[PDB]
């Protein structure tokens, strides 16, 4: 009896259909569900289009959420999944693995991420991270005959169990000290009629929550799990994770830290800062020494780039959240472009290491150009989009007093320019006796082309057309 | 309605209609409950309170409201007080009244009665789930229309 789950009830309908077709149909599925799932996704996006410019109305018995800011992320995760599925169709197609349950897993993980974006319940915001993590150790290991795909299931399951454990222990400490309360809004009341707020306790339930949060989006001191898994799992699920996991985690973090933690600002504003100052350093130095593409992307595009997003969560008087939304919208595209290019080239050749991208400009120049564009955008150069992203992230964040975080950001961006320009240099070359016999046999040439070309121009145009995006992102109060 | 049991506690003597598997809920000295459904008929509990006839606890419509809304209630409910009536069958001044306790789902009802005679303020109650409270209301009132003491 409520339409605020219908954006997810449609997804559930599509899930049930995808599970049914394999039970009933024989073999007509392979290119059929490939678009039938896209139908469910676009229909859910159309359903979310309705609730634009809506009220902060509370959920079923006040459970998850329904406001404007949360709806933004609810739509953004859908956007990520819509762009990602065409990538993770043909890749697993060319591995002779069952494809139905892979799309089922991706759909269910997207559902969990969508429910997580709200979840002002203290229990829903616990099951939903599991609905997003329980459907993650499967995908991140869903190539069983491989060997690396088992290491990137062991040292992902152990870590994601320990971290969710620490997080739920912090939740239990909060539930205890709060005189008994779950509803996210109704904690600063209940933590007052029980006068145990300013006491030790809360100081522990803040760290035991922030650590479990960090692990899910991997800043530096807990980044350990990310570089391995991103190399061990198939590239499409690497992209899917490295976009929607970050989006959902950053959507949950701001709400779980701003609503029930009015008072502790001066004691977590610092804390997150200690993460950011590390996240944008240790995630770059190593990125220099890399030779694998997926691992270098793990370092740079995640180990670091999860820095300047946070770079305003600390410095936020509600005048900055717009900048976080804009930077997320830029990052999704400027990351899915390069992941699409990498999937395409890897499939077409069969290698991942950097030293094989030589000469690719001469064999097929379109792919080299559409990869160089996204890489430079990640570098943050003026006419592109990443530049304006980082810019409006600093201009609101220098406008908020804190100085020893913007300087480090600019410096580590300059540092990050290095490996981007390194791989770019490796593209443009003509020393025939240097290029390995990998790009030499490349029959150059639908879905992946379409995704790559409609995701790369969104890495150049919005950086110059950010006026309506900015005017839209300013109406967020959460 | 059909059976008539003093329940041997030397005090009350009230009615209870039918099979009534005769639980022991927490209000001691008596109880009765149905089989198919939950939230069922009479329970009665004693208290010591050394005052006199109920007319001393204040005006009817106020002393009734200070406990139909503060004791027979819960902060997660909304109470609603319907008609209320004095009895005066042996000068005891009983206070029979029918109220509702609406909840998220429950919505229970009641025909509470009170006495003050030598047993010091011991009360009765009846109840049934709201989905069926209408069809047997007049079956339960004659239940409450039995409370006298000795």
């Amino acid at each position: 009896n409520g339409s605020f789950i219908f954006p997810e009830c449609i997804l559930i309908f599509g899930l049930i259909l995808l599970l049914m077709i394999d039970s009933t149909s024989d073999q007509k599925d392979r290119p059929w569900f490939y678009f039938i799932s896209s139908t469910s996704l676009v229909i859910s996006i159309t359903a979310l289009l309705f609730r634009w410019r809506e009220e902060p109305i509370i959920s079923f018995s006040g459970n998850f959420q329904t406001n404007n800011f949360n709806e933004i992320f609810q739509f953004l995760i859908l956007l990520c999944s819509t762009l990602c599925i065409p990538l993770s169709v043909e890749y697993i197609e060319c591995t002779e693995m069952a494809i139905t349950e892979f799309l089922l897993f991706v759909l269910t993980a997207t559902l969990g991420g969508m429910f997580l974006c709200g979840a002002n319940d203290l229990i829903t915001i616990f099951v939903a991270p599991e609905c997003f993590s329980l459907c993650s150790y499967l995908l991140s290991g869903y190539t069983k005959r491989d060997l690396r795909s088992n290491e990137a299931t062991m040292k992902y399951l152990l870590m994601g169990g320990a971290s969710s454990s620490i997080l739920v222990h912090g939740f239990s400490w909060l539930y205890g000290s709060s005189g008994g309360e779950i509803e996210l809004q109704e904690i600063v009341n209940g933590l007052i009629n029980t006068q145990m707020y300013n006491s030790p306790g809360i100081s522990i339930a803040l760290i035991s929550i922030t650590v479990g949060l960090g692990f899910k989006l991997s800043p530096a001191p807990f980044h350990q799990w990310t570089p391995d898994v991103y190399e061990g799992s198939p590239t499409p699920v690497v992209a899917f994770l490295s976009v929607t996991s970050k989006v959902a985690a950053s959507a949950s973090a701001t709400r779980i830290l701003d609503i029930p933690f009015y008072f502790s600002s001066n004691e977590w504003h610092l804390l997150l800062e200690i993460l950011a100052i590390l996240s944008m350093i240790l995630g770059n130095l190593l990125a220099i020494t890399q030779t694998s593409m997926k691992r270098m992307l793990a370092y740079s595009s995640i180990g670091q780039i999860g820095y300047v997003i946070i770079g305003i969560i600390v410095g936020d008087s509600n005048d900055g959240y717009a900048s976080m939304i804009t930077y997320m919208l830029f990052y999704i595209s400027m990351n899915l472009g390069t992941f699409a290019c990498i999937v395409l080239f890897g499939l077409r050749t069969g290698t991942d290491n950097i030293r094989d991208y030589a000469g690719l400009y001469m064999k097929d120049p379109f792919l080299a150009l559409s990869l160089a564009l996204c890489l430079l955008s990640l570098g943050g150069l003026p006419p592109l989009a990443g530049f304006f992203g980082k810019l409006y992230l600093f201009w609101c964040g220098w406008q908020a007093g804190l100085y020893f975080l913007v300087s480090i950001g600019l410096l580590t961006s300059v540092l990050s320019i290095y490996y981007y320009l390194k791989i770019i240099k490796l593209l443009m070359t003509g020393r025939n006796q240097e290029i390995t016999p990998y790009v030499r046999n490349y029959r150059r040439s639908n879905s992946i082309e379409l995704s790559m070309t409609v995701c790369v121009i969104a890495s150049t145009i919005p950086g110059i057309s950010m006026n309506p995006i900015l005017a839209i992102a300013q109406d967020t109060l959460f | 309605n059909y059976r008539s049991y003093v329940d041997a506690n030397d005090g009350y003597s009230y009615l209870y209609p039918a099979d009534w598997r005769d639980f022991d809920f927490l209000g001691h000295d008596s109880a009765f409950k149905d089989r198919n459904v939950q939230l069922q008929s009479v329970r009665v509990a004693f208290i010591p309170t050394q005052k006199t006839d109920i007319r001393d606890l204040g005006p009817m419509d106020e002393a009734i409201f200070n406990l139909v809304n503060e004791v027979y209630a819960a902060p997660n409910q909304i109470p609603t007080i319907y008609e209320m009536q004095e009895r005066t069958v042996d000068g005891r001044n009983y206070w029979t009244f029918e109220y509702d306790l609406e909840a998220p789902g429950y919505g229970v009802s009641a025909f509470a009665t009170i006495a003050i005679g030598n047993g010091r303020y011991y009360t009765l109650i009846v109840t049934a789930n709201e989905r069926r409270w209408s069809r047997l209301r007049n079956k339960l009132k004659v239940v409450a229309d039995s409370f006298k003491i000795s």
Binding site: - | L26, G27, H28, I47, P48, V71
Partner: protein, 129 residues
């Protein structure tokens, strides 16, 4: 009308009574008198059957008034104080039975003692001061 004196709450009942050793005469005379106006607040919570606090509060206030009544009574007027000891028997047997009539939850006896448990406690503290 200024603030008041906390006077040794402050602990988790493993710090107190086990690890912060100290109890002076006339200081237990505070706990004794406090559990009188203290235990006189459960009357609303005995009206409605809240059988889960009428046990925890009784256990705590007892285990507190089961040591003070042995320390405080040593410090009353010692020339004439057999009655100040002929009261602790009542003020600690009425409660020892109160704790019985809440374990298997009754109402008649529970409330018949929830008056004859405070009626006495106003006399143990009376011989003190």
């Amino acid at each position: 009308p200024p603030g008041t004196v906390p006077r040794w709450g402050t602990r988790s009942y493993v710090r107190e009574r086990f690890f912060e050793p100290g109890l002076t005469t006339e200081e237990a005379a505070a706990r004794i008198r406090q559990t009188a106006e203290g235990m006189r607040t459960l009357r609303p919570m005995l009206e409605t059957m809240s059988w889960k606090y009428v046990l925890f509060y009784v256990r705590l206030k007892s285990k507190y008034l089961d040591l003070d009544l042995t320390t405080a009574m040593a410090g009353v007027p010692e020339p004439r104080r057999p009655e100040y000891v002929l009261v602790a028997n009542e003020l600690v047997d009425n409660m020892t039975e109160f704790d019985r009539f809440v374990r298997t939850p009754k109402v008649y006896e529970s409330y018949l003692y929830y008056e004859k448990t405070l009626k006495s406690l106003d006399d143990v503290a009376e011989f003190l001061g």
